[PDB]
Design an enzyme around this catalytic site. Structure first.
Site, PDB file in Angstrom:
ATOM      1  N   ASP A  42     102.049  -1.374  42.774  1.00 51.65           N
ATOM      2  CA  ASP A  42     102.385  -0.206  43.586  1.00 51.65           C
ATOM      3  C   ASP A  42     103.066  -0.615  44.897  1.00 51.65           C
ATOM      4  O   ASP A  42     102.581  -0.364  45.994  1.00 51.65           O
ATOM      5  CB  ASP A  42     101.137   0.632  43.857  1.00 51.65           C
ATOM      6  CG  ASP A  42     101.467   1.997  44.428  1.00 51.65           C
ATOM      7  OD1 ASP A  42     102.644   2.410  44.336  1.00 51.65           O
ATOM      8  OD2 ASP A  42     100.551   2.650  44.978  1.00 51.65           O
ATOM      9  N   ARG A  63     105.811   3.107  51.831  1.00 50.13           N
ATOM     10  CA  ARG A  63     104.560   3.621  52.375  1.00 50.13           C
ATOM     11  C   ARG A  63     103.452   2.578  52.350  1.00 50.13           C
ATOM     12  O   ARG A  63     102.508   2.682  53.138  1.00 50.13           O
ATOM     13  CB  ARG A  63     104.111   4.864  51.600  1.00 50.13           C
ATOM     14  CG  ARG A  63     104.097   4.668  50.091  1.00 50.13           C
ATOM     15  CD  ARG A  63     103.078   5.562  49.405  1.00 50.13           C
ATOM     16  NE  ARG A  63     102.957   5.247  47.984  1.00 50.13           N
ATOM     17  CZ  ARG A  63     103.822   5.635  47.055  1.00 50.13           C
ATOM     18  NH1 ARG A  63     104.885   6.365  47.358  1.00 50.13           N
ATOM     19  NH2 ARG A  63     103.617   5.281  45.789  1.00 50.13           N
ATOM     20  N   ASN A  64     103.547   1.581  51.464  1.00 53.50           N
ATOM     21  CA  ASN A  64     102.533   0.545  51.301  1.00 53.50           C
ATOM     22  C   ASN A  64     102.886  -0.748  52.028  1.00 53.50           C
ATOM     23  O   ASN A  64     102.350  -1.812  51.692  1.00 53.50           O
ATOM     24  CB  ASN A  64     102.298   0.268  49.819  1.00 53.50           C
ATOM     25  CG  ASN A  64     101.405   1.298  49.179  1.00 53.50           C
ATOM     26  OD1 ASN A  64     100.595   1.937  49.855  1.00 53.50           O
ATOM     27  ND2 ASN A  64     101.533   1.459  47.869  1.00 53.50           N
ATOM     28  N   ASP A 105      97.709  -2.242  50.323  1.00 55.90           N
ATOM     29  CA  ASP A 105      97.385  -1.579  49.064  1.00 55.90           C
ATOM     30  C   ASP A 105      97.324  -2.550  47.894  1.00 55.90           C
ATOM     31  O   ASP A 105      97.507  -2.150  46.740  1.00 55.90           O
ATOM     32  CB  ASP A 105      98.374  -0.450  48.751  1.00 55.90           C
ATOM     33  CG  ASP A 105      97.702   0.741  48.112  1.00 55.90           C
ATOM     34  OD1 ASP A 105      96.589   1.077  48.545  1.00 55.90           O
ATOM     35  OD2 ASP A 105      98.281   1.343  47.186  1.00 55.90           O
TER      36      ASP A 105
HETATM   37  C1  LIG Z   1     102.443   5.185  55.680  1.00 51.66           C
HETATM   38  C2  LIG Z   1     101.214   5.617  55.884  1.00 51.66           C
HETATM   39  C3  LIG Z   1     100.289   4.877  56.848  1.00 51.66           C
HETATM   40  O1  LIG Z   1      99.615   3.986  56.454  1.00 51.66           O
HETATM   41  N1  LIG Z   1     100.266   5.290  58.241  1.00 51.66           N
HETATM   42  C4  LIG Z   1      99.454   4.700  59.299  1.00 51.66           C
HETATM   43  C5  LIG Z   1      98.967   3.396  59.270  1.00 51.66           C
HETATM   44  C6  LIG Z   1      98.202   2.917  60.335  1.00 51.66           C
HETATM   45  N2  LIG Z   1      97.664   1.573  60.364  1.00 51.66           N
HETATM   46  C7  LIG Z   1      96.927   0.985  59.265  1.00 51.66           C
HETATM   47  N3  LIG Z   1      96.240  -0.116  59.513  1.00 51.66           N
HETATM   48  C8  LIG Z   1      95.550  -0.733  58.576  1.00 51.66           C
HETATM   49  C9  LIG Z   1      95.551  -0.194  57.306  1.00 51.66           C
HETATM   50  C10 LIG Z   1      96.280   0.966  57.084  1.00 51.66           C
HETATM   51  N4  LIG Z   1      96.302   1.525  55.759  1.00 51.66           N
HETATM   52  C11 LIG Z   1      97.011   2.556  55.367  1.00 51.66           C
HETATM   53  C12 LIG Z   1      96.751   2.747  54.033  1.00 51.66           C
HETATM   54  C13 LIG Z   1      97.371   3.854  53.164  1.00 51.66           C
HETATM   55  N5  LIG Z   1      98.820   3.928  53.357  1.00 51.66           N
HETATM   56  C14 LIG Z   1      99.412   2.621  53.105  1.00 51.66           C
HETATM   57  C15 LIG Z   1      99.377   4.876  52.404  1.00 51.66           C
HETATM   58  C16 LIG Z   1      95.834   1.753  53.651  1.00 51.66           C
HETATM   59  C17 LIG Z   1      95.174   1.463  52.311  1.00 51.66           C
HETATM   60  C18 LIG Z   1      94.744   0.168  52.078  1.00 51.66           C
HETATM   61  C19 LIG Z   1      94.127  -0.150  50.882  1.00 51.66           C
HETATM   62  C20 LIG Z   1      93.931   0.830  49.926  1.00 51.66           C
HETATM   63  C21 LIG Z   1      94.357   2.127  50.162  1.00 51.66           C
HETATM   64  C22 LIG Z   1      94.974   2.446  51.356  1.00 51.66           C
HETATM   65  N6  LIG Z   1      95.577   1.013  54.727  1.00 51.66           N
HETATM   66  N7  LIG Z   1      96.958   1.526  58.065  1.00 51.66           N
HETATM   67  C23 LIG Z   1      97.940   3.728  61.425  1.00 51.66           C
HETATM   68  O2  LIG Z   1      97.187   3.246  62.493  1.00 51.66           O
HETATM   69  C24 LIG Z   1      97.887   3.310  63.704  1.00 51.66           C
HETATM   70  C25 LIG Z   1      98.429   5.017  61.464  1.00 51.66           C
HETATM   71  C26 LIG Z   1      99.185   5.486  60.413  1.00 51.66           C
HETATM   72  N8  LIG Z   1      99.651   6.854  60.491  1.00 51.66           N
HETATM   73  C27 LIG Z   1     100.297   7.313  61.721  1.00 51.66           C
HETATM   74  C28 LIG Z   1     100.960   8.662  61.476  1.00 51.66           C
HETATM   75  O3  LIG Z   1     100.523   9.273  60.302  1.00 51.66           O
HETATM   76  C29 LIG Z   1      99.167   9.236  60.028  1.00 51.66           C
HETATM   77  C30 LIG Z   1      98.607   7.835  60.188  1.00 51.66           C
END
Ligand SMILES: *CCC(=O)Nc1cc(Nc2nccc(-n3cc(CN(C)C)c(-c4ccccc4)n3)n2)c(OC)cc1N1CCOCC1
Lengths: 292, 300
Positions: A136, A140-141, A154
């Site tokens: 995947d 986005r990942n 992911d």
């Molecule tokens: C694109 C979407 C996104 O992730 N936005 C995001 C990320 C982060 N920082 C962050 N730090 C550590 C881990 C994650 N993260 C996101 C995700 C799911 N995404 C990739 C779709 C996962 C995940 C890991 C393993 C299994 C499943 C999911 N881990 N993200 C933010 O922190 C500042 C903030 C944001 N967004 C900002 C604006 O929109 C909402 C949140």
């Protein structure tokens, strides 16, 4: 020893970041025992509890995810096997690369885009070298640690518009199928977050692919870069490029970024000076990596 | 290239963290240009310096402070030279080592205490290899990045702020030559290093408590020093005493303190008598790998 076994009482979820799919992703705080510090973390929660010995096979995989040591792949730091499996990882304060490339729609130079393509291939080549398939890959990942440093998340575990034709018709996932998804990811970055095969129903994607129809040449891409993407989407999985080849090819272009990407105003969008780059790294990016 | 020049519009102070004679440290926020993110940093607003210095000179020494590259000395990251002098560094949530040891008073094992001494000696040796003199080494000027990783802070802040008739000047930490004739060498930094160890071994005691600072010079000339901390074997206390010899050349070198404290850290219970020490060991590799991946990406 690479997977810390948390307990519920030494962390807490603060605010939802993303939800829906896997489960919910939270901004979180780690509270060490005996200390009065709160360390921001990211927590991944699976909404469906249903786990007994399902938790043991999750722990078996969690040890593998805890062992990915690469500057361009996210490591699983810890696990809390409470109600619903809870995965703890580092917080990337800049968010994901899809949202990032969308917010900065026309404020992104060609050095960033090409370096991101290099950094994503290095992380993928790392995974292939460890005989692990991501299944995947998508913009986005990929997470933005700093604008100069991206990381693939992911990893662990349906994006029909991201899967190779063999994965659609037969659920065959290899490293050459990941190369396909990497080619859709690159297209996602070059078009600044456009949706692949927009509007077109996912159920008909296998049909349009069998007719040799592919994603269109993004406006800012010279033919050299689009041909790269085209080779990633070849029906013959073995004809597709290798991730090690993509590292070398995109790196060569990152040496002459303006010769391969035609961006309006690109002369005034360059990579940070050594000064901003030492500053970023000293604050949030003190980890060993490769010069970009 | 190593020192970022900040404008007042790209960072803002949030809350105070603690105040000292060099200035107040605030929990800060760096807003990078055209980004919707706030990055936490640490900001020191300096108190005005005696011998007021030109901004070209302050910047000329900010480049030296921003040049220290060692896992055990804090590097100055940015600066803002306006109506005040604000220094920007990486936020260390755990705080300074003096507050830490007072706070975990009888809960600290010997293996942590002896390792902190090695790490401080390693930062000091680096500053001596670079021909730099700290001038204000003390437990309050050592920061805790993680419990297993400490770093010396505030290097160069004494030289550029000077002092008035308060001789902001750490008297109960300076060698006699520094109190008498204001001589700051690498061997007087060893004198403050001994006192820094004594602060650690006493879990944050006030050295020479009850003796007015104006009278330290004289008791030092009579041969009176700091007392043996109760958990110290004579092995460690001997090393501390040697750091307080009047002949600066008879004092130990930092290169020697590194090896000597490494030796004791490999057999920590032979050298520090701490009640209940046989349950206060270092973290496991698991707990150590966790701290590094979260807060610290940069002798058992
Ligand atoms: C694109 C979407 C996104 O992730 N936005 C995001 C990320 C982060 N920082 C962050 N730090 C550590 C881990 C994650 N993260 C996101 C995700 C799911 N995404 C990739 C779709 C996962 C995940 C890991 C393993 C299994 C499943 C999911 N881990 N993200 C933010 O922190 C500042 C903030 C944001 N967004 C900002 C604006 O929109 C909402 C949140």
């Amino acid at each position: 020893a690479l997977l810390r076994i948390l307990k519920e009482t030494e962390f807490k979820k603060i605010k939802v970041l993303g939800s829906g799919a896997f489960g919910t992703v939270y901004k979180g705080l780690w509270i060490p025992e005996g200390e009065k510090v709160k360390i921001p973390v990211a927590i991944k929660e699976l909404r469906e509890a249903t786990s007994p010995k399902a938790n043991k096979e999750i722990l078996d995989e969690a040890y593998v995810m805890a062992s990915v040591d690469n500057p361009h792949v996210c490591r699983l730091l810890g696990i809390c096997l409470t109600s619903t499996v809870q995965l703890i990882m580092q917080l990337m304060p800049f968010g994901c690369l899809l949202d990032y490339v969308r917010e900065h729609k026309d404020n992104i130079g060609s050095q960033y885009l090409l370096n991101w393509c290099v950094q994503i291939a290095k992380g993928m080549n790392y995974l292939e070298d460890r005989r692990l398939v991501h299944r995947d890959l998508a913009a986005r990942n990929v997470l933005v640690k700093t604008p100069q440093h991206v990381k693939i998340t992911d990893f662990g575990l349906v994006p029909i518009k991201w899967m190779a034709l063999e994965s659609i018709l037969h659920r065959i996932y290899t490293h050459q199928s990941d190369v396909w998804s990497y080619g859709v990811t690159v297209w996602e970055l070059m078009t600044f977050g456009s949706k692949p095969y927009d509007g077109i129903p996912a159920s008909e994607i296998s049909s349009i692919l069998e007719k040799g129809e592919r994603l269109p040449q993004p406006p800012i891409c010279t033919i050299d870069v689009y041909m790269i993407m085209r080779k990633c989407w070849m029906i013959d999985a073995d004809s597709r490029p290798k991730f090690r080849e993509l590292i070398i090819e995109f790196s060569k272009m990152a040496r002459d970024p303006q010769r391969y990407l035609v961006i309006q105003g690109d002369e005034r969008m360059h990579l940070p000076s050594p000064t901003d780059s030492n500053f970023y790294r000293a604050l949030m990016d003190e980890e060993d990596m490769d010069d970009v």
